[PDB]
Structure 1
Amino acid sequence: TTTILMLPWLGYGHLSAFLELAKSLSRRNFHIYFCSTSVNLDAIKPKLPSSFSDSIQFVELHLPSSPEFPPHLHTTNGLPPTLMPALHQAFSMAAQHFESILQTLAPHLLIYDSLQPWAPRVASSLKIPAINFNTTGVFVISQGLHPIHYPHSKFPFSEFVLHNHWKAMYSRTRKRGEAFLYCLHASCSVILINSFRELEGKYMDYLSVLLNKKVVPVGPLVYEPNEGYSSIKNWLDKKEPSSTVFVSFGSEYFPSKEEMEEIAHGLEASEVNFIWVVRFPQGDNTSGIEDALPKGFLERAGERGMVVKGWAPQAKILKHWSTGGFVSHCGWNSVMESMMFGVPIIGVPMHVDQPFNAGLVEEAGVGVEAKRDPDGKIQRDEVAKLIKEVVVEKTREDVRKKAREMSEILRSKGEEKFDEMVAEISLLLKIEHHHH
């Protein structure tokens, strides 16, 4: 039996994609060692059915710990944004423990995420083949990589233009980009990517050309589940079909009080029904739902609005018939889920790869992006406008139509989605066994 150790990045969204990939390799007669911090393994084990206990084994990775950076903060999930540099640094310092795990378990293959250049380095030193699995899309990577080589040539196939807010943000930055691209470039033989050709095919081909690496799509990797929901469904069941937006900014972003004000006033002016997940970082004692929102906002919204604190059953909400839209930060898993369930996206991207994802959503026609003003600020009138058009007044039915067509395409895919990955792993291991 071929054994695979998988090392995701310490983000819930990355962990989620890695587990869905682990299940698929499970079903193709691979044994999976799933390695992350204990706080991350605690958050992900509930998502793994008991049927995989003999196929998927969780392995603990130790990060350096301090009373001020204790193990329960060894994740991006709810992490204070000012601790994100410490988490990246602590993660790199787990290379020694990672090497000892590889020597103890001696897996035949390492599948590693895009945010740990030390991981392929440790694997090569132990003569273990290592493959990058990139849990996000193609579009960002190629849109970012093209202007470095061809600053005077227009990006092919797209009309997307990056807003000056993110062009300044990503102008330290060089070091993180070089680290990110290294984990793709150093992958052996192929890069596995969490995307599908119906959405990004021509960008996958172009990226393979820019990187001089073979790119293998592993498809949309969407988790589908089988306390919170009961109360929420009772509220949603009283609404009209396709009348309600879900509002979420992911697992590792906390909008500013001023950003929340623009989102809230946009929801108010649109008169839509809404369910809004409001989260606070793990150390915040000073913040609350009423304080975080404009005064009187929820009493003006009345029964049109519901605020969920902490965490919501995102997939179940997106699948409810009353959901007509998704006001989302356009994290990659959120985008894949919304297409899988046929829900139009109202893009409010925030940072990293989200502004690119929003561009791709807009280009694919399965959603619309709320544009920021020239200074990079979210605009309550743009949010209200798009919710009105897409959900309330329904003058943008092309977006619903194309999202539903995309969901039928995705629902039609099966385990053949993983044939190309499995054949490339097979070939790589057969070749590396000869070279010893």
Structure 2
Amino acid sequence: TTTILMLPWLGYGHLSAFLELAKSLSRRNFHIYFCSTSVNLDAIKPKLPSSFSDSIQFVELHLPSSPEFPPHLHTTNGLPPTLMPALHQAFSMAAQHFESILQTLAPHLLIYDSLQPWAPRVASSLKIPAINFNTTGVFVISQGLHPIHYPHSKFPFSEFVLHNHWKAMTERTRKRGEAFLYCLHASCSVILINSFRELEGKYMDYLSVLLNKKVVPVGPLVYEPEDEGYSSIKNWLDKKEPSSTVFVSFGSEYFPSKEEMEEIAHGLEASEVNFIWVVRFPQGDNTSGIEDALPKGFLERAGERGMVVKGWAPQAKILKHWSTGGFVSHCGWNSVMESMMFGVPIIGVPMHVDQPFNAGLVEEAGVGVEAKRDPDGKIQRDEVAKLIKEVVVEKTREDVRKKAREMSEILRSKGEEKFDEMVAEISLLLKIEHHHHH
């Protein structure tokens, strides 16, 4: 049996997408070693049905630990943002443990994420082929690589303009970029990406030219789950009108500022929509409460229309509920893919990293709308309220709703043939590499 070790970056969205890919590979008679920190493995274990217990094996990776950065913080999930550089550095320091794991397990292939250039380096030293799997979409990667080759030319095939807020948003950025570049360039023969041609084909073709490598889509990769946490939420949603409610979430690794929450809250209130909003506090803060993060009296004024959930909610179950008419989202790529799969239009409030590019692609495909920031880069309560009202409450953006339903139909028609290309490229790569090693 051909064995694959998978090494996601230490974020919940990365773990989730890698796990869905692991499931699809396991059904093609690959044996998977799924490698991450213990805190990440514990968070993802509930998402693996017992049907996979024999073919997907978890392997713990150990990072350097200290009382001030202990192992339960070795994840981006709820991590204080100021600890993000320490987490990247600690992950790079796991390379020797990673080498010993690869020596002991001797997998035939490594599939690695784009935040760990040390991983393909270790694999190559051990004569283990390594392929890069990207859990973002293609658009942001092609936008990042284009200036390296065409520094004086506008990006082709798109009218998207990045807001000055993010253009402004030095060596931390450069080294993360150069690490990302290495991960792409080091990949053996192909790169894998969680996207699909109907959405991003022209950008995959362009990225393939920029890299001189085949770009292989393996998307849509979307996780779909008796549940007590959803029960209370389900009971509330069951009393609402169809397509009347928005889910509001900024993902697993972002905490909007007090001012950002103010604009979102006032946008929700003015729109008169029903909403479920996930509000979170960073690890180590178990004093803070919902009431302090929100404007004074906001939940009192919202009354029956509003529900705030602390910490975490069953996002996929909520989006699939017939009451949900929209998704106010930071536009993390897994959230975008889920929203498209479930046919829910996106109201984009991107915050950082790849999100503004994802929101621009959402707008371009017409399956959602982006709440634009004002000249100074602030979220605008008026823009949030107007888009919720148009898309969900009054439903005057029927173009958006129809395109989102159309996209869902397309995505639901896809089957296991979406993995045919990846499996053939893996087979070829391993057969070429077997001759080399000989």
Structure 1 length-normalised TM: 0.99
Q: CA deviation at 1:173?
A: 1.0
CA distance in 2: counterparts of 1:304 and 1:373, whole angstroms: 28
Deviation at 1:58, TM superposition (A): 0.3
Q: Distance in 2 between matches of 1:130 and 1:152?
A: 33
1:340 aligns with 2:344: no
Q: Distance in 1 between the 2:146 and 2:364 partners?
A: 18
Deviations 1:374-416 (A, max 9, x none): 1111111110010011001111011010000000000000000
C-alpha distance in structure 1 between counterparts of 2:71 and 2:152, whole Å: 47
Work out the CA distance in 2 between the residues paired with 1:303 and 1:267.
13
1:75-94 deviations in Å (ceiling 9; x for gaps): 00010101111000000000
The equivalent residue for 1:322 is 323
Structure 1 unaligned blocks of 5 or more? none
Return structure 1 stretches of 4+ with deviation > 6 angstroms.
none
In the TM superposition, what are the counterparts of 1:10-409 in structure 2 within 5 Å? 10-169=10-169, 172-225=172-225, 227-409=228-410
SS class of match (1:31): strand
- The answer as to whether partners of 2:8 and 2:18 remain within 8 angstroms in 1 is yes
SS in 1 for 2:65: coil
- Could you tell me how far apart the structure 1 residues matched to 2:216 and 2:148 are? 24
2:155 partner SS: coil
What is the CA-CA distance between 1:145 and the residue it aligns to? 2.2
Map residues 396-435 of structure 1 onto 2, 5 A cutoff.
396-432=397-433, 433-435=435-437
Segment drifting more, 161-170 vs 85-94: 161-170
Q: Which deviates more, 136-145 or 184-193?
A: 136-145
- Structure 1 residues 116, 171: closer, same or farther in 2, change over 3 A? closer
Following TM superposition, by how much is the alpha carbon of 1:181 offset from its aligned partner in structure 2, in angstroms? 1.3
Distance, in Å, in 2 between the alignment partners of 1:148 and 1:348 is 28
CA distance in 2: counterparts of 1:9 and 1:170, whole angstroms:
22
1:151 Cα deviation (Å)? 3.6
Kindly provide the CA deviation profile for residues 146-165 of structure 1, in whole angstroms up to 9, marking residues without a partner as x: 23432432321111000001
CA apart distance, 1:334: 0.1
Mapped to 1, the partners of 2:152 and 2:90 lie a distance apart of: 39
| CA-to-aligned-CA distance 1:268-319 (integer Å, 9 cap, x gap) | 0000000000000011244210010000000100000000000000000000
Deviation at 1:170, TM superposition (A): 8.0
CA distance in 1, matches of 2:51, 2:150: 50
Distance, in Å, in 2 between the alignment partners of 1:356 and 1:419 is 28
Shift of 1:214: 1.0
Distance in 2 between residues matched to 1:144 and 1:434, nearest whole Å: 33
8 Å Cα contact 2:318-2:324 kept in structure 1: yes
**Range 280-289 or range 334-343, more displaced:** 280-289
- How far residue 14 of structure 1 moved from its aligned partner, in angstroms, is 0.3
- Secondary structure of the residue aligned to 1:245 is strand
The answer to whether the Cα contact below 8 Å between 2:189 and 2:429 also exists between their aligned partners in 1 is: yes
Aligned pair in 2 of structure 1 residues 93, 2: CA closer, same or farther (>3 Å)?
same
Q: 1:170 to 1:365 in 2, by over 3 A?
A: farther
Partners of 2:309 and 2:286 in 1: CA distance: 18
Whole-Å separation in 2 of the counterparts to 1:122 and 1:151: 32
Aligned to 1:398, the other structure's residue is in SS state helix
Q: CA separation in 1, counterparts of 2:108 and 2:154?
A: 43
Deviations 1:68-113 (A, max 9, x none): 1010000000101011110000000000000000000000000000
How far apart in 2 are the matches of 1:197 and 1:96? Answer: 38
Structure 2 SS opposite 1:111: strand
| Displacement after TM superposition at 1:174 (Å) | 1.1
Deviations 1:325-361 (A, max 9, x none): 0000000000000000000000000000000000000
2:127–2:437 Cα contact (<8 Å) kept: no
* Distance in 1 of aligned mates of 2:150 and 2:375: 26
Unaligned runs of at least 5 residues, structure 2 = none
Give the drift of 1:435. 4.4
Cα distance in 1 for residues equivalent to 2:126 and 2:437: 14
Matches of 2:172 and 2:40, distance apart in 1: 27
Between the aligned partners of 1:190 and 1:151, the Cα distance in structure 2 is 25
Aligned counterparts of 1:143 and 1:171: Cα–Cα separation in 2? 20
Structure 2: distance between partners of 1:289 and 1:2: 49
Aligned-partner Cα distance in 1 for 2:407–2:28: 27
| 3-state SS, counterpart of residue 172 of structure 1 | helix
Question: Secondary structure in 2 aligned to 1:346?
Answer: strand
C-alpha separation in 2, matches of 1:54 and 1:191: 27
Q: Distance in 2 between matches of 1:7 and 1:280?
A: 27
Alpha carbons 2:342, 2:408 under 8 Å: kept: yes
Residue 283 of structure 1 aligns to a residue in which SS? coil
Query: How far apart, CA to CA, are the structure 1 residues paired with 2:286 and 2:207?
Result: 45
Seq. identity, %: 99
SS of the aligned residue for 2:25 comes to helix
**3-state secondary structure, aligned to 2:171:** coil
Separation of aligned partners in 2, 1:153 and 1:94: 39
> Aligned partners of 1:252, 1:368: CA distance in 2, in Å?
22
Deviates more, 1:140-149 or 1:14-23: 140-149
How many angstroms apart in 2 are the aligned matches of 1:210 and 1:431?
24
Q: Structure 1 residue 171: deviation in Å?
A: 9.4
Quote the Cα distance in structure 2 between the aligned partners of 1:13 and 1:64: 23
Please state how far the C-alpha of 1:144 moved relative to its aligned partner: 2.3
Per-residue CA deviations over 1:106-159 (Å, capped at 9, x if unaligned) read: 000000000000000000000000000011111011122223432432321111
Distance 1:239 1:170 in 2: 48
Give the SS at the match of 2:402: helix
Distance 1:173 1:97 in 2: 27
CA RMSD of aligned residues (A): 1.1
Verify: 1:6 aligned to 2:41, yes or no. no
